Subunit: 296 residues, 4 copies
C-alpha cells in the first residue's frame, strides 16, 4: 500500500415501546426537536467534527424513512450510507455492523438522540478528532449520573474507573453519547461478551481503552448544554430550549445546510438550490439569508 | 345518526423540515400523535363512524397507525385529498361516506380541552337540522373565520381571514351539519368552509354557540404553537395523573369496548406509562 | 352572608433566595402577583369581605399592594400569623373577623381555572349549613389531604399526607364553612385543616364535590410548579387576548365597580398591556 | 502619589409601569428568574469578570430592598455600595451618579436585567477587563436588532458605526448590556446632551470611544446565550431556560456564593456558614455539596 481520516456512525436505533404511542407512528430520531428532526442534531455534531462519511444505523423498518429524509448526503457535501440493526443488542454492536464501513479508518460514534449546544463546540471536537491514536470521550456534570456511564477521577483529575449505570455512582460525571476511536475499536468490539442485561456495552469498550492507558476523558464544561431526549418531558424541554435560542438570535442550531456551507463542503450556488423548495417557509428564507449575511 | 370527518390535510412545506420525515397530524403533542386529539373529540361527541381525509402521501400512514378502528369500537374509513383546495372540499370527497346522514367535521390539528366538553358537543350533535359551530374569543381573529354579533348577541356576518375583523370571536375547527351540506358544498365557487357556514347563516339555520374562556382551544399550526400545546397538555397530565384525549379510555368509558378488550390494548404498551395507565383504568374509579 | 380568608402564609426558607427579596404570594405568575388568583377566586364566589392573613414581615407588603380594596369594590382587612402553626389557625386569628357569619378559606398559592367555575363555587357558597370542599384527581396524593370514597361515591375518610393514600383524590385549597368552624377550630389539638374537615365529616355535614378533570388546579409551591403555572396562564392569555384572574375585570362584571371607576384604574396602567386591556373592557362585549 | 483595578456598576433602574401589575409589588430586578432574584445574574457576571467593588444604582424606593437582599457584600467577599437614580434619565447617567464611586479607576457597567450563559464566559470577560485603555463592548447576533444599540461592521470585520434603536438596522449585531471603560468615561459622560428621547444614551458614550479609535467590539458568539428579560414572556423563557440547565446538570448558573468560593474571595469555613440558614432547601444543600464535590 502507498499513502498520499475519520468516519462517522450515528446509532439511531429502536427505542422500544417506552415512548409509545408518540413513537407508534414513527421512530424517535425522526421526531422533531422544535423545528427539525432529531437526527439533524447528532448529524450536525459529526459535521462540526469535520466528518463527511457517515453510517446511519437504524431498525429495518426505519431505515427507508431516514433514507428519504437524508438521501446519500451528496446535496450537503456528505456521503451517507445505511445499515440495519435487526435487534437492539447494545450500542457497541454498531462496530460489528459498521465493520466494513469503518475498514481501516478512525471512527466516531454519536447517539441518535443526543443534543449538544455551546461556544467553541467546533474546537472541542477538533482536539478529539485530531488525536489519531486511542479513544476520546467527554464527561459532563449531571444530576442523575445513574442513567449513564459514570467516570471516576482521582485527585489529580485522572480518570481511574468507568461504570455503566451504577446504582451508586462514584461521581456526577456522565459519559456523553459522543465517542472518538482509533483503528483498535472493531477488534475490542469483537471480543466483548453480552452484559448481564443482554447488551454489548459501550462502557466495556471504553474500559478497554482505559485499561491500556489510551482513553482521553475531556471535560465538557457546564457552559455547554447536553440535553436529554429520553422522555416525553425531556424532548419537550429540548424543544423549548432550542426555540428560545433560535428566536432570540435569528440563527439556527444544527442546521446541516449551514454547517456544510460554512465548512466549504457546498458552495453558494448549491446552497441557493436547497433554499428554493423551502422558500415559502422560515427555514428556506433562513438558508437564502445565509447567502448574503456575514455571521461571525 | 351522525358521521365524522377528520380533515388531516396537507400542511405544505411550512413546517419543513420537521414534516419532511412525516406528516403533521402524526407529530406528537406531548405523549401522543396529534390526530388523537380531534379523534378523541369526535368520540366524545358520540361519533363512531369516521372518515380520515389526508394527502396521498399521508393517508396510508394514518391507515397503518389507526387501522379500521375496530380495536377501539370505531369504524374508520379513509380518503385522499389530491390538492389542498380548501376545507369545504371535505364534503365532495366525503360525499358517498356521508350518504344521507348528518355529519360533523373537525380539523386535524385542532385541540380542545375543558369541563363538560361532552355536554357542549351533546347539544350540538342533538340539533338534527341546520348547522352548529363554536365561536371563541382570540387575540388574532385575522387568522380565522370571524363571527360578528349584534347587540342582542345574534350572529349577523361571517368573514374568512378579514384584514379588519369585526370582532375577536373566531370560528373554531369543529363543525356540525345536517343533510344539506353536501349540496351547499357542490354549489360553491372558488372552497371555503366560511362560505358553507355563510349559506347556513343566510337561511337562518346557523347556530353559533360561544365556547367560553374556561375552555382551551389550541392550534397546532406552527412550530411555536405545537410546542405550547405540548407544554399545556404535559402540565395537565402530570398534575392529574390522568390523560387528555386518550382514545382507548374514551372508548372504554363510552362502553364501545369492554374491560377485556381494554386489557388487550394495555398489553403491548405494558412497559411504558401509557400502557400502565390503560391497565390502571381497569381498577380505578375516576369521576 | 359569607366572608373570605386568604391564607398567604410563611413559606419559610424553601424558596430562598427568590423569596429573600419578597414573599411568595407576591411573586408573579406570568403577568400578575400570585395573590391575585385566590383573590379572584373569592370574588368569583361572590365574596367581597376578605381577611388576608400573612407573616409579620409580609402583611404590611400585601397592605401596601392591595389597600382596603375600595378601588375594586371590596372590603379587605389584614391580620398576621406569627408562626406557621397550621392552616386551621386561620380560624382563631380570623375569629373576630368571621363573627357569626359563614366563611370561605382559600390558600394563597392555589390557582384554579375552568368553565363554569363561577357556578361550581355558587353551589358551595349557597349551602348555608355544614362544610363544602373539592376533591381533584392528582398524580401525587401523598402531598395533600386525601379523600376516600365508598363504592357509592360517598366520602368515608380523610387523611393528611398519608404515606399510603387510599385514593388519588386530593382536597383542594378552597374551603366553605358554616358558623361551627371557629368552635371546631378552638377544640383542635396539635393545627390541621384536615382535622377540621374530619370533624364535619364525622357529623355527616361535609359535602365533597368533585372538581372534574376539565378544571385546572395548580399549585404554586415550588420553583418548578410556579414556572409551570406561568407557562400555563401565558398560553391561555396569549391565545384568547383575555385575562385569567384580573380582579378589576371580575369587580366590573360583578357590578361592584362601574364603568367610570374601571376607567380610572386603567389610567395609571395605560402605557402597558394590562391597562390597555382594562380600557378595552369598557367597549368590548365578552361572552 | 505613589503606586504599589476595575470597579463595577449594576444599573437596576426604574422599569416604569411596562410590567405592571407584577412590578407594583416589587421592582423588576428583584423578580426571580427561576430560583433566584434577577439581580443575582448581572452581579454574578461582574464577579466572573474579577470585579469585587460594585455600585448598585436603583430607584429611591427600591434601594432599601436591594440592600436587604445583598447587604454590603462582605459575606461574599465583595464591597457593595448603593446609590439612587431619582428619575430614569438614561443609562449613561450611571457615570454621573457613579462619579465619586469610580474615582480615578477603570469601570464596568452591566444592566440589571441582562442574563448571560456559556462556555469560557470567564475568559471572554477576562480579555475585556484586562485591556486597561479604551472601552470594550460585546456584539451578539439577534432577531430584533431594532431594540438595541446596533453595530455595523465593514468587510474586514471592523466596527464603523453605532446606532441606538435604529428603525432600519444596518446589521443584526446588537450591543449587549455589558460595558468596560477606562478613566475617560466620566468626562465623556459629563459632555453628553439628552437625546431626542430625553435620555443620556449609552450608545453616545460608545460612539465617542469609537470616534477616537478606542472601542473594542468583540463578538459574543452564537454558542453563548444572551437572554431577554424585558417582557413577561421573555422573563418566563429565561426561567425555563435556567431551570432546564440547572436540573440537567445539578449545578447552578449565577450562584454568587459559588462564584466567590471558586474565586477564593471566601474560604470553605465561610461558605459553610452561608449554607447553614439555607440548609432546609435545595439552595443551601447545594452550597454544602460544593464543600466536598470537585467540579471541573
Ligand atoms: C450553535 N452551534 C453552531 C455553530 N457554532 N455554527 C457555526 C459553525 C459552523 C460550521 C463550522 C464552525 F466551525 C462553526 C453553526 O453554524 N451552527 C451551529 O449550530 S453548535 O456548535 O453549539 C452546534 C453545532 C452542531 C450541532 C449542535 C450544536
Ligand atoms: C379532559 N377531557 C377528557 C375527559 N373529560 N374524559 C372523560 C370522559 C370520557 C367520555 C365521556 C365523558 F363525558 C367524559 C376523558 O375520558 N378524556 C379527556 O380527555 S376533555 O373532555 O376536555 C377532552 C375530550 C376529548 C379530547 C380532548 C379533551
Ligand atoms: C377564566 N376564568 C375567568 C372568567 N370566567 N371570568 C368571567 C367572569 C367574571 C365574573 C363572573 C363570571 F361568571 C364570569 C373572568 O372574568 N375572569 C376569569 O379569570 S375562571 O372562572 O376559570 C377564574 C376565576 C377566578 C380566578 C381564576 C380563574
Ligand atoms: C455557567 N457559568 C458559570 C460558571 N462557568 N462557573 C464556574 C466558574 C466560577 C468562578 C470562576 C470561574 F472562572 C468559573 C460558575 O461557578 N457559575 C456559573 O454560573 S457562566 O460563566 O455562563 C455564568 C457566570 C456568571 C453569570 C452568568 C453565567
Ligand atoms: Cl464551561
Ligand atoms: Cl367558561
Ligand atoms: Cl370536567
Ligand atoms: Cl460561539
Amino acid at each position: 500500500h502507498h499513502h498520499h481520516k475519520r468516519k462517522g456512525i450515528i446509532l439511531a436505533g429502536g427505542s422500544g415501546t417506552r415512548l409509545h404511542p408518540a413513537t407508534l407512528a414513527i421512530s424517535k430520531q425522526l421526531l422533531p426537536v422544535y423545528d427539525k428532526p432529531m437526527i439533524y442534531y447528532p448529524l450536525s455534531t459529526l459535521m462540526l467534527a469535520g466528518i463527511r462519511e457517515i453510517l446511519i444505523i437504524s431498525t429495518p423498518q426505519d431505515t427507508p424513512r431516514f433514507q428519504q429524509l437524508l438521501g446519500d448526503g451528496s446535496n450537503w457535501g456528505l456521503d451517507l450510507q445505511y445499515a440495519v440493526q435487526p435487534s437492539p443488542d447494545g450500542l457497541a454492536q454498531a462496530f460489528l455492523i459498521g465493520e466494513s464501513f469503518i475498514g481501516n479508518d478512525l471512527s466516531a460514534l454519536v447517539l441518535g438522540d443526543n443534543l449538544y449546544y455551546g461556544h467553541d463546540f467546533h474546537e472541542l471536537l477538533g482536539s478529539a478528532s485530531q488525536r489519531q491514536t486511542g479513544a476520546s470521550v467527554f464527561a459532563y456534570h449531571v444530576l442523575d449520573p445513574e442513567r449513564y456511564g459514570v467516570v471516576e477521577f482521582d485527585q489529580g483529575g485522572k480518570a481511574i474507573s468507568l461504570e455503566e449505570k451504577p446504582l451508586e455512582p462514584k461521581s456526577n460525571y456522565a459519559v456523553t453519547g459522543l465517542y472518538f476511536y482509533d483503528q483498535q475499536v472493531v477488534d475490542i468490539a469483537r471480543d466483548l461478551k453480552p452484559s448481564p442485561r443482554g447488551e454489548l456495552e459501550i462502557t466495556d469498550v471504553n474500559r478497554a481503552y482505559l485499561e491500556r492507558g489510551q482513553l482521553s476523558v475531556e471535560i465538557m464544561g457546564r457552559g455547554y448544554a447536553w440535553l436529554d431526549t429520553g422522555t416525553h418531558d425531556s424532548l419537550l424541554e429540548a424543544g423549548q430550549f432550542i426555540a428560545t435560542l433560535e428566536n432570540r438570535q435569528g440563527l439556527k442550531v444544527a442546521c446541516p445546510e449551514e454547517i456544510a456551507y460554512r465548512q466549504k463542503w457546498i458552495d453558494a450556488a448549491q446552497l441557493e438550490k436547497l433554499a428554493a423548495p423551502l422558500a415559502k417557509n422560515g427555514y428556506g428564507q433562513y438558508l437564502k439569508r445565509l447567502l448574503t449575511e456575514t455571521v461571525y
